[PDB]
A paper describes a structure:
The crystal structures of P (strain BM11596) and P (strain BM11596) in complex with LNFP I were solved. The VP8* of P BM11596 strain adopted a classical galectin-like fold as similar to other known VP8* structures, with two twisted antiparallel β-sheets consisting of strands A, L, C, D, G, H and M, B, I, J, K, respectively. The specific interactions between LNFP I and P VP8* were revealed by the crystal structure. The Galβ1-3GlcNAc type 1 precursor in the LNFP I-bound P VP8* inserted into the pocket formed by W81, M167, A183, T184, T185, R209, E212, and appeared to be stabilized through hydrogen bonding and hydrophobic interactions. The Gal-IV moiety was stabilized by F168, Y170, and W174 through hydrophobic interactions and the terminal Glc-V moiety was stabilized by Y170, S172, Y187 though hydrophobic interactions and N171 through hydrogen bonding. The Fuc-I pointed away from the protein surface, consistent with the STD NMR results. Some key residues involved in the binding pocket in the P[II] genogroup are highly conserved, e.g. W81 in the βB strand, W174 in the βJ strand, T184 and T185 in the βK strand, R209 in the βm-αA loop, and E212 in the αA helix. These highly conserved key residues in the P[II] genogroup are consistent with the crystal structures showing that P /P /P /P in the P[II] genotype can bind the Lewis negative type 1 HBGAs in the βα site. From the recent X-ray crystallography studies, it was found that P, P, P, P employed the βα binding site to accommodate H type 1 ligand LNFP I, which is consistent with our NMR-driven HADDOCK results.
The protease-sensitive VP4 proteins protrude from the outer capsid shell, forming sixty spikes that are responsible for host receptor interactions. Each VP4 protein is cleaved by trypsin into two domains, VP5* and VP8*, corresponding to the stalk and the distal head of the spike protein, respectively. The distal VP8* head interacts with RV host glycan receptors for viral attachment, while the VP5* stalk assists in viral penetration into host cells. The RV VP8* domain adopts a classical galectin-like fold with the central structure being an anti-parallel β-sandwich formed by a five-stranded β-sheet and a six-stranded β-sheet.
Residue numbers in the entry:
A (entry chain D), B (entry chain C), D (entry chain B): 2 to 159
C (entry chain A): 2 to 160
C-alpha cells in the first residue's frame, strides 16, 4: 500500500492496482488511449431513483441513466471502443467500502465488479495498452499485482 | 417443481418466479407494459470478444455490443422506461447454471444479477405492473415467492 | 454468521435480517417509528391453555389473550398503525427452533410466519421505514438480505 | 362429499367436517354455544390494504382491521370466550382454493389454518360442545372425520 496520492493524471505502470478512495466525486476515473478504449467509473450514492445525470467524460457532456435501489454505493463502469460511440454501462461495483480498482496488465484494463464482499476482477481488451492514461479525480493508492489478495480484501472489506 | 412449461406470450401471475431454462436462445425474455417498463434478457455464451450482435426486441432490431471473457454464461438485462429510448445494459447475471428469473411482485419487476453462487434479487419500478406481459422464448418453471429460497438455490447451484 | 449481539435498543440497518434467539423472554422485540407502525413479538411457550397475560409494549401495560395447543413455541406478532389504536394479533410463527426475524427493506417491515419448517416472510407497509427503531430483549444475529436463504434456513431448521 | 347444501342455521353433528365453499361473502361462519365459544370466519380477498372493515357478528356491529398482501384469499378466524368481550384475530387460513373447515369433535371446535397447500388443523376447547350451533352463509359439504385426509386434500388443493 503506497499512498495516499492526491488526484492526478498518469499512465499507471503495468502490473499495479490503483485503489481509488472517493468521498463524493461523481466521476472517479477517466481512462483512454484515444484509439480503442474509453473507461469511466461513475459513483452513484445510495437510494437514487431512476434518473438521467450529466457527467463530463473526456471533455464531452453526457446524459447517463442511473439507479441505485440499495443502501450501498455503486460504481458504474462506462465503456466504449470508438471515439464516436455512446458509452455502454458495462459493469457495476456495488460497495459499502467505497473503494474501487483500476489496473493495466496483460494487454488488458482490469476493474472490480459485483457486490462486496464478493467483488471480483474482470477486464476490457486493447491492442494499445501502453497508451492508456488515467485522469484520477480521487485520493488513491498503488498495490502491486503480487499483492492483489490484499487489494481484493480492501475492495471487499475496507 | 412446477413445469417445465413451453415458450409462450402471456401475463405471468404476481408472486411467482418464472425460472427460465434456455439452451442457447439469443433472447430469453421480453417483458413490457408498453408504458414505463421494457426489460429484455439476452443470453451471451462463454468466450465472446467485444462484438456487436443483432437482437430483435419487442419487434425492434437492435445492434448491441456484448462481451463475455468468462467460461460462464451471462444474461444481459437490457432496460428502458420510454418507448422512444435506446436500451441500457442495466444488470448482468453471470451463471454456472444457465438459469435466470423474472417475477412481478409488490409493484415491481424482480430479476437476479451478480455471479453464481452469489446472485441476488433487485427490482425495476413501474406505475403499471398489472399490464406487464412477457414473451418467454425458453422452457420455464414457476415457483411461488413463498419458496423464493428454492428459486435462489436453483439460480445459484442448478 | 454475524453475532451473537446482546439485547439492545437501536435502529436496525436497512436490508439486514435481525435473527432473534430467545430463551424464555415474554416480549422478544418492540419496533416502531412512532408514527405508522408498531410491531411487538410475544413468545408463548408450548402447551399454554387459553388465558390473559400481561405485556408491557412501548411502555404501556396490555392484557392479551394467548393460547398454544402445540409442543412448538409461538411468536405472536402484535401490530397497529396508529399511536391511538389497540394492538391486533396479526401473525403467528409456530417454531421448533425458537428463532424469529425482523428486517427493514423496500419501505416495509418483514417478519416470518406460519409453522417450521415451512415458515415464509410477509410484510407491513410504512411511509417512514428509516425511523423504525427496535428494543431487542434477546440475543440476536445479523444476516444481510443477500443471504436471506440462510436466514430462512436458520428460522426453519435452527442454528 | 355430502352436498352441496345451501346457507342455513343448524347444529352440526359431532365428528363431521363442514367444508365451506364461499364465493364472495364477508362472513363465512358464525358459531357459538352462547357460553364459552364464539368463532367467526371472515373472508378477505387478495391485495387488500390495511383497513378497518365492518362485520355483523352474532348481531353485534364490529370494526375489524384486516390486510391481505397476497394473491390468495384469507379466512380471518375471530374468537372470544365471553359474549361481552372483544373478538381477537386468533388464526388465519391463507388459501388459493377458497375452501375452509369447521368440525365439532371430542371437547373442541376445529378449523384449518396456515397457508395452502400446508394448511393444518387446530382447536378451541369448550366445556359445552353439544350446544355449539353455526350460521353458515355459504354453500357447504359434510364429511365424516374418518375421511379427514380427503377434507385436508380439498382444503389444500381444491
Ligand atoms: C396427533 C393427532 O392425531 N392429531 C389429530 C387430532 O387428534 C385429536 C384426537 O386424537 C383426540 C382424541 O380423540 O385427542 C386430541 O388431543 C388433545 C385434545 O384436543 C385436547 O383437547 C386435550 O386437552 O388433550 C388431547 C390429547 O389426547 C387430538 O388432537 O384430531 C384432529 C381433528 O380431527 C386432526 O386434525 C389431527 O390430525 C393431525 O393433524 C395434523 C394437522 O392437520 C396433520 O394432518 C397430522 O398428520 C394429522 O395426523 C393424522 O391424522 C389423524 C387422524 C391420526 O390418524 C394421526 O395418526 C395421523 O397422523
Amino acid at each position: 500500500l503506497d499512498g495516499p496520492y492526491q488526484p492526478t493524471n498518469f499512465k499507471p505502470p503495468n502490473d499495479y492496482w490503483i485503489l481509488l478512495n472517493p468521498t463524493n466525486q461523481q466521476v472517479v476515473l477517466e481512462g483512454t488511449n484515444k484509439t480503442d478504449i474509453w473507461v469511466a467509473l461513475l459513483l452513484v450514492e445510495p437510494n437514487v431513483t431512476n434518473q438521467s445525470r450529466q457527467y463530463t467524460l473526456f471533455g464531452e457532456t453526457k446524459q447517463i441513466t442511473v439507479e441505485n435501489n440499495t443502501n450501498k454505493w455503486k460504481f458504474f463502469e462506462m465503456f466504449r471502443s470508438n471515439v464516436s460511440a455512446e458509452f455502454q454501462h458495462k459493469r457495476t461495483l456495488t460497495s459499502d467500502t467505497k473503494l474501487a480498482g483500476f489496473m493495466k496488465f496483460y494487454n488488458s484494463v482490469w476493474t472490480f465488479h459485483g457486490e462486496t464482499p464478493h467483488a471480483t476482477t474482470d477486464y476490457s481488451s486493447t491492442s494499445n495498452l501502453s497508451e492508456v492514461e488515467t485522469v484520477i479525480h480521487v485520493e488513491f493508492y498503488i498495490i502491486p499485482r503480487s499483492q492483489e489478495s490484499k487489494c481484493s480484501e480492501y475492495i471487499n472489506t475496507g
